[PDB]
C-alpha cells in the first residue's frame, strides 16, 4: 500500500546515486587526529512503479587513511578486500517494497550476507524519507536498521504545500536497540552489570538534512550526520572522545526506466538488524603467530612493559577470528607455548576455546584418567554442539574407554533432543560402531560388550538412521559365535529400541528355542515381556509346562503368578493378556528359591492428594542352578 | 575361575561397569604409577644440573565489560574496556656443576594497566577505533652471580643496564587500523620533560622524572595529565 503522501520520487525513474561516506574516529584536542575510512559507491535506485523498488549497487571503492598531509589532509588507499568488497556488492541486486511507507520488508536474492544486508539497510534508512506533512512538530514511530524510533520531523522550507528543506532527527538513546548488544567476555572477569552505567556516559544524536524536489518529489540530495561523544577522559566534561558518521548521497542522474515489474526475493526480511559474528579476515591469524613469537622473544629480552597489553589486543583479534581456522592453526600455537595458550583459552569465553580444550588435552598427552574425567564432566553440559560432538567422537576413537563412550552416548542423546536433524556426525559414528560390531559381534568380550551396551544408550537414534545395524543386532542375538555375555548385552541394547513385531518375533524364537541357554532364555523372555502380545503370551504359556531347565519353569511360573498378584494400573491391562493366555494351560507349581531360579516382585502404591497415584515397582530376581549354594546371578 | 561384572543404570542409563579384569587393570595402573615414580628424582635433578629459566606469569582480567551497538549506516560500534593484572615473576637458577659457578635470577614484576576501546567495525572487513590506556608497572629483584675458582670466591651482582622503574604512571592513546595499531604522537607545544636524580651511589642515581605536554590553555585538549602520552615515572638510573 503506497500512500501518495509517502511519494518521494517518480515512477519509471532510475535514480543513480553516488554513495560517499566516511567514519573518522579521532581526538579533537590533537587536530581531530583520527582513524578515517572512505567508502565510495555507485548506487542505482530503480522505480518502475510507486513503492516497488529495485536497487543495483556498483563501483564500490573502499579506501582508508594510510597517512596525513602536514595540513591534516588524509591519504586514502584501496584495501586488499576492497575488490572482493565490490564483487560482493555488485554480484547482488535488491528488491524491496514498503507497505504504508513505515513497514519495511526486504526480499534479497540468493541470501545476501547479513552484514552486507545490514549496510544496505542503513543505506535505505538514510534513503527513507517520511510521508509529507504540514506539521513542523511531527514526531512519530519509525523502523530503522536500528529498530523502531521516535523520530522528529520539522519542515525547514516549504513551497506551496510541498516541503523543499527538511531535517530528520532522533536521539539515539530512545530507539529500540540501545540495549548493549551482548559480546563474549572474559568468563573469569568478576565485574558484572556495569554496562548500563556506561550508556549514561555515552552521548549521541542523529540529524539528516534533505533537499527535495517539489516537482517529482525526488530527493535532490541527502546529508546524514551523526556524532557520538564519550564523557570520561575529559576535563570540564568536554575534552572527551568524539566519533562521527558522515554519509552523503548525491543524485548524479535520474534516468527514466521503461519498467513496470518488481521482484521479491524468496527470503522475506525486515529493516531491523540480524545478529552477526565479530568476523575477521583469515590472514590476521598469522599476525597472532607473529605476536606469540614476539612475546616469547620478549621474555628472553626480559621486558614485560606491554606484554599484558599485547595479550589483550591478541585475544581481541582472537575474538575476531573463526572456529575451524583456529582449530587448524591450534597445533602450531601449542608448539609455541602451552601455558600461554592456556591463559588465552581460560580467558577466552568463546565456545570454540572450550571445545578446543579437548584438543589441547590430547595434545598435552593427558593421562587417561583425567581425560575420561573431563570427558564426562563436559558431556553433561546441556545443548551439545555438532563440533563438540565431533571432538567427542575423535576422543572416543582415540582412547576407546568406558567413560568416554558413555559420555558420548549421553551427549548423543542430548544433542539428538537439541537437533532432530540426522546430521552427518550421527551417520559417521553409526558407521564406526557398525564396524565395531559387524554382524557376528566377534571381538574382545569387554570391548564388544561395552560397544553393544553403549549403542543401546542411543537405540532410538539408531532405529531412525540405520536399520541395518538393528538387523545385525538381531543377527548377533541369534548368533552362536558371541559369548552369552555378549548375547545378553545385545539383548539389552534393545533398551532404547523398543522391540517391534520383528524384534519380538526374534526374541520369541531365541527364547522358545529349547536349546537356548537358561539365562539367555530368561533374558529374552524378560525383554519380550516388556511389551508382549496376547498371541505371544498364549504361545509361551502353552510351552511353559514342557520347558526344560526346571529352574526356568519355576522362574517363569512365579513371574506369571506375581503378574496376576499385581494390581498396578498397567499390570491391570497386562493381566488381561495373561488371562487370555491362561485359558488352555496350567502353570508348573513354583517350588524352591535357594537352588532354583525364582521371581518375586512388590509394588508400593500411594495415593497422593491432587496427584496421580505413585507406584514404586520392585523386582527380585534370583538365579539358581540346583548346584548353587548362593545366587549365581541377581539384579536389583 | 569365576568371571563377574556389574553395572549401574539410572533411568536405564548405564553408569559404567566393574569387572575383575578391571581390578587387574587397576593393579597394573598402580604398578605403572610406581614405574613413573622411580625415575622422577633423576629427571628433576637433571634440569638443575644443566640449569634453565623459570617463568611464572599470570595474566588475568579481573575487570572487563565488552559489548557493541549498531550504527545508522549498519556498521557495528564496538565498545569495551578492561582492567587486567599480570603479576608473574622471572626465575630459574642454572648450576655449572664441577665449575661451581652459580647464576641466579629473581625479579617479580607488576603490570597494572587499563584500557578502554571503542571501535566501528565492518565484520570480516575492517575496523576503526581508539584505545584509552592508563598504565602502572613495577618490577624489583636481584641479578646475582657466584663462582668458586681455584680457592678464589667472588659474589657478582651485574649492574642495571637500563633504568629500574620502581613506579611507572603512563597514559596513552592509539589509532588502530585492521592491519595496524598506531600511537598518537604527543604535542610539542609546552612539551614539559624534566628529571631529578639523586645519588644512591656514584654510579647509580635515584631518578624522578616527568614527560608531558602542558596544553591546558589550549581548547579541545584535556589538561596536562591527559591529551597525550603522559609519563610520571620513578626509577633508579644506572649511570653506566
Curated annotation (Swiss-Prot), chain B:
<feature type="glycosylation site" description="N-linked (GlcNAc...) asparagine">
    <location>
        <position position="214"/>
    </location>
</feature>
<protein>
    <recommendedName>
        <fullName>Apolipoprotein B-48</fullName>
    </recommendedName>
</protein>
<feature type="region of interest" description="Heparin-binding">
    <location>
        <begin position="133"/>
        <end position="190"/>
    </location>
</feature>
<feature type="disulfide bond">
    <location>
        <begin position="197"/>
        <end position="207"/>
    </location>
</feature>
Amino acid at each position: 500500500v503506497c500512500p501518495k503522501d509517502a511519494t518521494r520520487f517518480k515512477h519509471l525513474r532510475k535514480y543513480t546515486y553516488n554513495y560517499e561516506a566516511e567514519s573518522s574516529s579521532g581526538v579533537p584536542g590533537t587536530a581531530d587526529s583520527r582513524s578515517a575510512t572512505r567508502i565510495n559507491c555507485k548506487v542505482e535506485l530503480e522505480v518502475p512503479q510507486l513503492c516497488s523498488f529495485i536497487l543495483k549497487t556498483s563501483q564500490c571503492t573502499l579506501k582508508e587513511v594510510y597517512g596525513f598531509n602536514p595540513e591534516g589532509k588524509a591519504l586514502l588507499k584501496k584495501t586488499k578486500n576492497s575488490e572482493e568488497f565490490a564483487a560482493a556488492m555488485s554480484r547482488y541486486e535488491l528488491k524491496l517494497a514498503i507497505p504504508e511507507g513505515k513497514q519495511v520488508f526486504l526480499y534479497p536474492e540468493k541470501d545476501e550476507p547479513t552484514y552486507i544486508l545490514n549496510i544496505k539497510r542503513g543505506i535505505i534508512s538514510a534513503l527513507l524519507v517520511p510521508p509529507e506533512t504540514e506539521e513542523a512538530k511531527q514526531v512519530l514511530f519509525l523502523d530503522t536498521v536500528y529498530g523502531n524510533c521516535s523520530t522528529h520531523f520539522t519542515v525547514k522550507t516549504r513551497k506551496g504545500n510541498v516541503a523543499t528543506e527538511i531535517s530528520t532527527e532522533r536521539d539515539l538513546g530512545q530507539c529500540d536497540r540501545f540495549k548493549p548488544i551482548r559480546t563474549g567476555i572474559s568468563p573469569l572477569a568478576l565485574i558484572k552489570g556495569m554496562t548500563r552505567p556506561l550508556s549514561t556516559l555515552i552521548s549521541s544524536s542523529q540529524s539528516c538534512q534533505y533537499t527535495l524536489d517539489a516537482k517529482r518529489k525526488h530527493v535532490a540530495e541527502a546529508i546524514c550526520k551523526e556524532q557520538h561523544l564519550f564523557l570520561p577522559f575529559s576535563y570540564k566534561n568536554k575534552y572527551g572522545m568524539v566519533a562521527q558518521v558522515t554519509q552523503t548521497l548525491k543524485l548524479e542522474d535520474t534516468p527514466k526506466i521503461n519498467s513496470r515489474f518488481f521482484g521479491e526475493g524468496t527470503k522475506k526480511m525486515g529493516l531491523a538488524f540480524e545478529s552477526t559474528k565479530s568476523t575477521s579476515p583469515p590472514k590476521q591469524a598469522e599476525a597472532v603467530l607473529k605476536t606469540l613469537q614476539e612475546l616469547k622473544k620478549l621474555t628472553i629480552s626480559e621486558q614485560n612493559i606491554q606484554r599484558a597489553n599485547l595479550f589483550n589486543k591478541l585475544v581481541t583479534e582472537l575474538r575476531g577470528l573463526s572456529d575451524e581456522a583456529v582449530t587448524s592453526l591450534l597445533p602450531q600455537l601449542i608448539e609455541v607455548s602451552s601455558p600461554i595458550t592456556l591463559q588465552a583459552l581460560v580467558q577466552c569465553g568463546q565456545p570454540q576455546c572450550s571445545t578446543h580444550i579437548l584438543q589441547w588435552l590430547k595434545r598435552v598427552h593427558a593421562n587417561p584418567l583425567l581425560i575420561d574425567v573431563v570427558t564426562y564432566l563436559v558431556a553433561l553440559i546441556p545443548e551439545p554442539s555438532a563440533q563438540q560432538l565431533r571432538e567427542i567422537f575423535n576422543m572416543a576413537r582415540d582412547q576407546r574407554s568406558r567413560a568416554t563412550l558413555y559420555a558420548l552416548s549421553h551427549a548423543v542423546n542430548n544433542y539428538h533432543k537439541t537437533n532432530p536433524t540426522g546430521t552427518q556426525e550421527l551417520l559417521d559414528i553409526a558407521n564406526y560402531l557398525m564396524e565395531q560390531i559387524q554382524d557376528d559381534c566377534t571381538g574382545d568380550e569387554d570391548y564388544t560388550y561395552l560397544i553393544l551396551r553403549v549403542i543401546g544408550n542411543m537405540g532410538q537414534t539408531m532405529e531412525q538412521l540405520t536399520p541395518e545395524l538393528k538387523s545385525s543386532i538381531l543377527k548377533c542375538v541369534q548368533s552362536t559365535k558371541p559369548s552369552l555375555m555378549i548375547q545378553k548385552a545385545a539383548i539389552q541394547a534393545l533398551r532404547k529400541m523398543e522391540p517391534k513385531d520383528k524384534d519380538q518375533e526374534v526374541l520369541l524364537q531365541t527364547f522358545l528355542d529349547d536349546a537356548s541357554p537358561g539365562d539367555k532364555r530368561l533374558a529374552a523372555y524378560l525383554m519380550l515381556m516388556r511389551s508382549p502380545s496376547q498371541a505371544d503370551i498364549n504361545k509361551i504359556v502353552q510351552i511353559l509346562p514342557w520347558e526344560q531347565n526346571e529352574q526356568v519353569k519355576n522362574f517363569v511360573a512365579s513371574h506369571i503368578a506375581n503378574i496376576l498378584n499385581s494390581e498396578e494400573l498397567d499390570i491391570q491391562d497386562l493381566k488381561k493378556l495373561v488371562k487370555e493366555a491362561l485359558k488352555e494351560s496350567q502353570l508348573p507349581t513354583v517350588m524352591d528359591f535357594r537352588k532354583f531360579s525364582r521371581n518375586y516382585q512388590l509394588y508400593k502404591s500411594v495415593s497422593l492428594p491432587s496427584l496421580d497415584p505413585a507406584s514404586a515397582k520392585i523386582e527380585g530376581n534370583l538365579i539358581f542352578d540346583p548346584n548353587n549354594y548362593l545366587p549365581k546371578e541377581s539384579m536389583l | 575361575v569365576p568371571e563377574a561384572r556389574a553395572y549401574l543404570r539410572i533411568l536405564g542409563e548405564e553408569l559404567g561397569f566393574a569387572s575383575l579384569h578391571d581390578l587387574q587393570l587397576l593393579g597394573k595402573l598402580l604398578l605403572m604409577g610406581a614405574r613413573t615414580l622411580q625415575g622422577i628424582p633423576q629427571m628433576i635433578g637433571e634440569v638443575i644440573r644443566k640449569g634453565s629459566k623459570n617463568d611464572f606469569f599470570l595474566h588475568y582480567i579481573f575487570m572487563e565489560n565488552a559489548f557493541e551497538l549498531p550504527t545508522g549506516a549498519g556498521l557495528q560500534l564496538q565498545i569495551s574496556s578492561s582492567g587486567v593484572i599480570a603479576p608473574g615473576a622471572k626465575a630459574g637458577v642454572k648450576l655449572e656443576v664441577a665449575n661451581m659457578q652459580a647464576e641466579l635470577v629473581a625479579k617479580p614484576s607488576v603490570s597494572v594497566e587499563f584500557v578502554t576501546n571503542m571501535g566501528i567495525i565492518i565484520p570480516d572487513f575492517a575496523r576503526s577505533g581508539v584505545q584509552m590506556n592508563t598504565n602502572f608497572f613495577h618490577e624489583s629483584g636481584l641479578e646475582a652471580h657466584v663462582a668458586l675458582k681455584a680457592g678464589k670466591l667472588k659474589f657478582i651482582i651485574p649492574s642495571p643496564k637500563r633504568p629500574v622503574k620502581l613506579l611507572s604512571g603512563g597514559n596513552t592513546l592509539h589509532l588502530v587500523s585492521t592491519t595496524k595499531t598506531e600511537v598518537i604522537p604527543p604535542l610539542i607545544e609546552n612539551r614539559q620533560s624534566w628529571s631529578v636524580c639523586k645519588q644512591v651511589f656514584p654510579g647509580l642515581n635515584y631518578c624522578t622524572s616527568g614527560a608531558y605536554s602542558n596544553a591546558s590553555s589550549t581548547d579541545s585538549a584535556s589538561y596536562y595529565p591527559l591529551t597525550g602520552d603522559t609519563r610520571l615515572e620513578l626509577e633508579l638510573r644506572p649511570t653506566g
